[model samples]
Target: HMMMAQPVPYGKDTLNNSPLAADGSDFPCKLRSNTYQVTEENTAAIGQSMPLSFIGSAVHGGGSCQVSLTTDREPTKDSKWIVIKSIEGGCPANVDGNKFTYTIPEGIEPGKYTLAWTWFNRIGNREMYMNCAPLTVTGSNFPPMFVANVNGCTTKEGVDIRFPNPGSIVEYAGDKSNLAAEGSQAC
Candidate 1:
């Protein structure tokens, strides 16, 4: 049960660090309901390198994670999320509560947006972990984040995801060769 620890996510009070449902019931952020609550807001400037970390111990041997953005103030499953940066492994962290960095990128307008973090574990039952926050981005834009391990789809197990659309800025933190098989279906 690992979830974002820093730059608190929306609905932080009840942002349970649980794997999303295989049925896609929790495809995006795991909201208990559609009436999402905002617990905090984070500010990021254009091209700024923002830092983040998770709160739990099970990093699942470190995995790939995407820091994404969405215009939806109240996001739904169909919300279009674009990748700002992709941490290709060692995301959340292979060890403990280590902080990771992500660039805000360019092209986005000044306003509120949903900050999304989605991950695919390298081990354990193929799963996706997502946590989102209310962010006031001063600037940004990028490709859509990879979507799998939910909605009846799946990402590969036992290896890090190799995102085909990992945007411009990518960080290679995990092993160089242990990438996925097409990063698995739905990627």
Candidate 2:
């Protein structure tokens, strides 16, 4: 399990490194709250580079994760998370301080939105880790993050998840040969 550290995700002060429920009880974020703070860490400009830092258990051999956004300040079950970037592999890197990077796109409006990081591990249990941050994005679709290993969809435990629709901005740093034979939900 891991928690976002760079932009100070929502509930950073208290939330632990826990995966979302098997029933998607916490689809977007594990925490349910509306008390948001826009510090310097939570601010982002259009086309700006942002770091995705994680703090918790092992990186789990670097799985795939999605960087997404929603207009809802406090994301809910019905909130739509539009993924701007997806890390095909080497996400939550084992040696890179559990950190990665993504850019703020031009699709979203310049206002408050929720930034979500959803991940599926490659070397451990088939589970989903979701964390959300309060972002003042100055952002597009691309697509929705691959929701797998939780609720209805599941993935192989040993292979990295290959997102069905990874959008345009994707980073592939893991072993491509180790990717799941089937797409995110097909497995």
Candidate 3:
């Protein structure tokens, strides 16, 4: 699903049956370039938060969500991807909850980069859903925004999440609330 201020060549998950290859080398957008060109109009600034939302069904079950960036103008398997935010569980709203937001970190040098969102599933095969949007990060700066509503959501500085612990919803936000229900895996 396309969000406001997002680029054209968003990533695709073709099989829709399997998780992304563990190495992340199987990202589909890198294989086929989009017809649209990157421009300032599609850019997102550094140091400020932006909203993103998913449209259509939340395919498969929900697990974790992550936002990442790479300096490569045309990212490939060789590009270095930098993760900015990681949500350990509950995203794309298993039940018509598609709204989510993310912030660009400060101090990132201005450049054209590929912004990516990856979602991991809980009940299915170890699947990873990925989307990449072309973006130019401008010089504007602001403090990073905090993400609430989801359980175990943390910044890149916190836990390095390769995969979420299935059925676990440990809260990292200051609210100190536990999972939605006792022994509930749904976040």
Candidate 4:
């Protein structure tokens, strides 16, 4: 399966330049950097299909900001992450004004996963964004098994013994009349 995003980051403003906003002019409000919050989807079964989604929000939407996304195992200042998805467009406010969507690929394997989304403002000197989330897909449904046959052998020597296939049988010591007492033979 394929993830929608890589290395999550803390939330950030779509239109700002400083770590913290100085006034209403800086898109006032604190946002989370992209980081793995927790595992969302667990290890999914094989052959099953599901969507890997991610949740991110834009603090203030005004500038043309692109969303770069990836996935990873843990959170860190500088760690290698997996790219899942990216959107090159302005993030307009929803009916509320603080959320966006990242869609994942279908038919993934049974394992843990992560999602990351980075917001980049069009302004050359503007601040960049990063966010990450954890997920897991599990529970493989394997098919049942069937046994074919069972047999035994003996040796030609005087020693009483029961041996494996392609060998000799020493003696048929058991009651020979009850050979068909167990389950029915197929052939």
Candidate 5:
């Protein structure tokens, strides 16, 4: 019989980012390049409903996957991810197959948070997984603005004009009298 050891590191995961179970057991398998995407309701405005979306891909083997989002460092059976949502679709091998989206509860304030996603092989039931480094959400509404100015001298024939001149000329002219002073400069 082939026997495998437990608590073995997988991929580029670390003890901080990937912690071992209390029993020192290892994840059944390793997942690569798991990712997450997020969006909020009324994102145009500040302090609006936030809906955080999560997706996992590059999974191998037939197994059930679990995900969690939390303000805490370590997740437990009562962890927030299990409380947030559960996807029943089994992950496909080496392909993008599973996807899940969870709405941030209304009570939670607008700010930064972390999400952890774990996968278990149907056969081994180990906590193989992936996690987002960290995510931040800022609440604010500020509009953008643009401004321009034109200056020229009013003459009997028409008007002596300058395509682009120093702003000091405009402020000094007060109107358009000093066009000749800095006019026709052509920017």
Candidate 6:
């Protein structure tokens, strides 16, 4: 299963829908160049919560999931990406089946940005799944989603993901290890 401009699946399943190579070359966007074009229907707002759903099995169970944002219309390794939300464990289907929501932080400058979803499977080979969506943030006044102490580009490639404490929601707020317990939360 070669990488395409589609949603990448998590874990070591028969469907090789992963965008990252064996060596973990690509960071934010899979393959970097092969991006899924954004349309009016797929667009999201700056200060709104957006829902993302999966269409297949909950491959290898769920692990850590992170929602990151980069202002660069064309995101790269050097892009300034900030982690908006992160789930230590239980994602992609934590609450509702195969569905998760991410709230676009306020104060995000209205412009073309790349929103990325990265998943680390709880079981199977050490693999990381990444999917980047082109988005337009529109708004003027809202609380900004601050950058947390965690790394936005953290990868689980070649490393199995294990949450010492499961079901923890780590919110980003400018260089602080902030941890909170949120019920029915997913990536």
Tell me the lDDT of model 1 at 88. Answer: 81
- Model 1 misplaced regions, further than 4 Å: 33-35, 96-98, 139-141, 181-187
Per-residue lDDT for 1-187 in model 5, tens only?
0101111122223223332232423321212332222222122112333333333333333332233345433322333332233332243222334323334433445555544433332232233344332434345211111001111211111122232312211111112431233334321
- Single out the weakest 10-residue window by summed lDDT for candidate 1: 178-187
Clashes of each: 1, 4, 3, 44, 2, 1
In model 6, which residue pairs have backbone atoms overlapping below 3 Å? Answer: 147-174
Candidates ranked by lDDT, best first? 1, 2, 6, 3, 4, 5
Per-residue C-alpha lDDT of model 3 across residues 43-93, encoded as one tens digit per residue: 667766677655444443444566777777666655677667655545544
- What would you estimate as the lDDT of candidate 4? 0.29
Candidate 3 ranges with C-alpha deviation above 4 Å: 1-25, 28-30, 33-41, 96-98, 140-187
Ranking by TM-score: 1, 2, 6, 3, 4, 5
The local lDDT score (0 to 100) that residue 42 gets in candidate 3 is 45
The candidate maximizing lDDT is 1
User: What lDDT does each candidate get?
Assistant: 0.79, 0.76, 0.47, 0.29, 0.29, 0.49
Indicate which candidate wins on TM-score: 1
Positional deviation of 32 in candidate 2, in angstroms?
Answer: 4.9
Candidate 6 residue-wise lDDT at 6: 27
lDDT tens string, model 2, 1-187?
7877887876666567888888877676875553244433488889888777888867888888898888888666777778899887788884434247888887667888888888888877778998778887653247876677676767777676778888888788888786665444535
Q: Which one wins by TM-score: 5 or 6?
A: 6
TM-score of each: 0.89, 0.87, 0.59, 0.36, 0.35, 0.61
Q: Where does model 4 exceed 4 Å of error?
A: 1-72, 92-100, 106-108, 123-125, 138-187
Error of 4 at 14 (Å): 20
lDDT of 6 by residue, 1-187 (tens): 1221222322112323553554546554655333544433145676677775454444444556566667776666577766666755554443224245766665456676677666665455545666666666765322122221123334333222332323223532211122223332212
